[PDB]
């Protein structure tokens, strides 16, 4: 009906309309958005956005740390059965080992069977890149131009084994022993130089093997790019759907054998966490494109008119709403995996395995040992705790973001007429 009988009931609205008419209050609100933007995209420990990115990525890594030791893999480079082919990937979490062996012969790679070596190559590379970056520490979300260097090895023995043949890498026909090739590769739209080198080794009393070294120079470490790597890791597991079987007083794996894509509730959560972090990282560009540091007021030195001097308000609203979205999504990521709200086999998988570390003493993130297998070793519990801590310490900033969203919303309304 009329404004008074309305403000009788909703007195915090009267106060809002008063702030919306006062430049000193509008500018105070804009200073605040400036500051909370910095907490969100310029900080690390105290940013919920950062902790949520880090959690999504660590969940992916942790899932493979738990289950890789038990995953069948093998065959030759053409994706077919091999007779006698042993292919060993270094710095992976295998049974009592820092390497995973793929030497399942005779059976044909594919669904409900052994993972082909082409897939394991895709999986490995993403794993080495993620663990390398986890080790050096993830950058703040605004820093999206950084790079790192990544290096990893794998070997081939057995007669018939085509997995390290030089034509696969563009190295000469000769040149398995000593040959090398340097070649730009394309990763998340950026240009990476990659050197691939081959040597033959002939030990004293045991079989000859080829060793391949991959050196990736200028890999991007931005949140966007590392989320793409996590996505490759978990999608390759889920699409290839290989067979696994576990060596089980202590925690109980459910199911104990079968196909890996059969952890549907776990892979769907992981994929949703990644998706939610991708969309969270995309608010970064909306914040940057609507900076709030220019002060506002009336003009020709007249007093401020909220119905005509407020064309800045659409920007202010977009900036505030984006921040509120980064906060809600960060919280969503954590709730998808927090064991306090899980049941059944899923809860058991998380508290039993994913959120634990059997490595020897807690060594730094990104670290594989002979005792990594069957546990997550990706700081999943500590990351949950720190997400919650950052959120508790964002109490005031969340309230300021809401006030600036309300002020800008009021001004946008006034200015339609």
């Amino acid at each position, epitope marked *: 009906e009329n404004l008074s009988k309305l403000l009788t009931r909703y007195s915090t609205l009267n106060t809002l309309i008063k702030l919306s008419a006062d430049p000193s209050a509008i500018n105070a609100a804009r200073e605040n958005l400036g500051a909370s933007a910095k907490n969100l995209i310029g900080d690390t420990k105290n940013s919920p956005a950062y902790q949520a990115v880090l959690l999504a990525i660590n969940a992916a890594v942790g899932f493979w740390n738990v289950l890789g030791y038990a995953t069948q893999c093998g065959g030759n480079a053409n994706g077919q059965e091999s007779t006698s082919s042993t292919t060993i990937f270094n710095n992976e979490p295998g049974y009592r080992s820092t390497s995973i062996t793929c030497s399942l012969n005779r059976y044909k790679p594919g669904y409900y069977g052994p993972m082909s070596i082409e897939n394991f190559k895709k999986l490995n590379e993403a794993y080495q890149i993620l663990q390398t970056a986890l080790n050096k520490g993830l950058p703040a979300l605004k820093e999206n131009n950084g790079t790192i260097n990544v290096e990893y090895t794998y070997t081939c023995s057995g007669g018939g084994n085509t997995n390290c043949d030089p034509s696969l890498f563009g190295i000469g026909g000769d040149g398995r022993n000593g040959g090398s090739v340097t070649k730009t590769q394309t990763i998340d739209g950026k240009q990476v130089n990659t050197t691939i080198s081959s040597k033959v080794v002939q030990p004293p009393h045991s079989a000859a093997y080829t060793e391949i070294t991959n050196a990736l120079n200028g890999v991007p470490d931005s949140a966007q790019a590392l989320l793409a790597q996590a996505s490759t890791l978990i999608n390759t597991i889920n699409t290839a759907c290989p067979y696994f079987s576990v060596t089980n007083g202590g925690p109980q794996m459910e199911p104990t054998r079968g196909k890996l894509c059969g952890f549907t509730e776990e892979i769907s959560a992981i994929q949703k966490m990644i998706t939610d972090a991708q969309e969270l990282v995309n608010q970064t560009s909306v914040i940057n494109e609507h900076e709030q540091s220019t002060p506002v007021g009336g003009n020709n030195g007249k007093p401020f008119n909220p119905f005509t001097d407020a064309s800045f308000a659409q920007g202010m609203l977009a900036n505030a709403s984006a921040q509120a979205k980064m906060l809600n999504l960060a919280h969503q990521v954590g709730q998808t995996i927090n064991p306090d709200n899980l049941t059944g086999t899923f809860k058991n998988f998380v508290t039993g395995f994913l959120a634990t570390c059997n490595n020897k003493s807690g060594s730094p993130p990104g670290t594989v040992t002979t005792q990594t297998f069957a546990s997550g070793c990706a700081y999943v519990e500590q990351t949950i705790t720190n997400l919650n801590n950052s959120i508790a310490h964002f109490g005031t900033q*969340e309230q300021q973001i809401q006030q600036a969203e309300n002020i800008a919303d009021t001004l946008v309304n006034f200015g339609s007429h």
Partner: nanobody, 113 residues
Framework: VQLQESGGGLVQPGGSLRLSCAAS????????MGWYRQAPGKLREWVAA???????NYADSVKGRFTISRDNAKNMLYLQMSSLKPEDTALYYC????????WGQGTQVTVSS
């Protein structure tokens, strides 16, 4: 999906109070929870918060006088106020952090000489 505050009333400066909030499990469980107030002529102000594992943190205006706490078995949040001043007068409210869409009725606290 429900928030119910209680325990408030009129007290004397230097006096003391205990507020309770009853929350539904879907809000409470596994979530940071916190307390807020809205004083006359102002917008809602954040007061205190506490993580599921029990770690508290407070706004500068109340630090050293208020204690926040939670009971995870019964879905309850509490706020214990000491050394109260007139400036602490307001409608007190509870929620999770980040905030659920809909607020409860709150509980009135008044401090008057």
């Amino acid at each position: 999906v429900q928030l119910q505050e209680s325990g408030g009333g009129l007290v004397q400066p230097g006096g003391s109070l205990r507020l309770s909030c009853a929350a539904s499990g879907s809000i409470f469980s596994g979530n940071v929870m916190g307390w807020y107030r809205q004083a006359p002529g102002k917008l809602r102000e954040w007061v205190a918060a506490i993580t599921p594992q029990g770690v508290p943190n407070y706004a500068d205006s109340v630090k050293g006088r208020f204690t926040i706490s939670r009971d995870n078995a019964k879905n309850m949040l509490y706020l214990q106020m000491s050394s109260l001043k007139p400036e602490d007068t307001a409608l007190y409210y509870c929620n999770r952090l980040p905030n659920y869409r809909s607020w409860g009725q709150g509980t009135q606290v008044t401090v008057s000489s």
